[PDB]
Amino acid sequence: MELVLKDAQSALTVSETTFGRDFNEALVHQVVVAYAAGARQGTRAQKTRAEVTGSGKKPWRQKGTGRARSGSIKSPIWRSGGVTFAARPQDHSQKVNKKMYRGALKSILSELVRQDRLIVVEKFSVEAPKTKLLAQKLKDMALEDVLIITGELDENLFLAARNLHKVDVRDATGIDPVSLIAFDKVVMTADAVKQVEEMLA
């Protein structure tokens, strides 16, 4: 189980259980649904018949008038003050097992290898914090829509990438399941591999 380095020509030996294992479609899907659910601002509300502004008086004399019987100008059948089952602010976040999360990261990463969307390099950094400088590099590597995962949260690299929409930078500690999918190519530093490896193991 060896992932060939792009340019250094120095193969890197990795765990086949992490980078070489089969794609579990049903598992990966569950972890991606929960991440997106975990991102919601569950912020909304409506008013129940208790919460609409207005009075408590019956409109009618119960009987004798030809109308339909009424109790409340805030009844949900009435124009204004409806909303039978009004909304509250709510928490949409979901549980994921530690192991189902790690297992899921491993499956997706292993697919990345198989689809040749994972790119391993010795180093990945930039000189001065100029987005233009990064842009030049990326074209040279024939990359455009790409996630960068580096060994340490490199700042120059971080600054240079902010205005490039198709480029994101991340330290190994801050990875997540959906980003590793959402980009056409994924770049990892040699150091980045060793940190990801230890984490999933």
């Binding site: 008038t65 030809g66 109308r67």
Partner: peptide, 27 residues
């Protein structure tokens, strides 16, 4: 200069008191 009319067609007249009132039955 034909501005809509006051109309004053608010209709809270409903509903006035309502006896039969009426036939006697049936005891």
């Amino acid at each position: 200069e034909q501005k809509l009319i006051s109309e004053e067609d608010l209709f809270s007249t409903p509903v006035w008191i309502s006896q039969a009132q009426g036939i006697r039955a049936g005891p």
